[PDB]
């Protein structure tokens, strides 16, 4: 399903797909999941994370 995202935590590539580590709203740190970029509809949170690397 589609859930609200609280923060993007990390980024990786697995089997040719870009993935982002998502912290879900209402979920805990145990609920974080890696989701491919096609699953993501949180551009503001993605950009904040990438800008936050550097």
């Amino acid at each position: 399903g589609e859930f609200v995202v609280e923060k993007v935590l990390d980024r990786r590539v697995v089997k040719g797909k870009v993935e982002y580590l998502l912290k879900w709203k209402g979920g805990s740190d145990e609920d974080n999941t890696w989701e491919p970029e096609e699953n993501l509809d949180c551009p503001d949170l993605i950009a904040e994370f990438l800008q936050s690397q550097k």
């Binding site: 399903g1 995202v5 999941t33 509809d41 949180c42 503001d44």
Partner: peptide, 8 residues
């Protein structure tokens, strides 16, 4: 806007 994502 609403920050959402699909969960696999």
């Amino acid at each position: 806007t609403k920050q959402t994502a699909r969960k696999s």
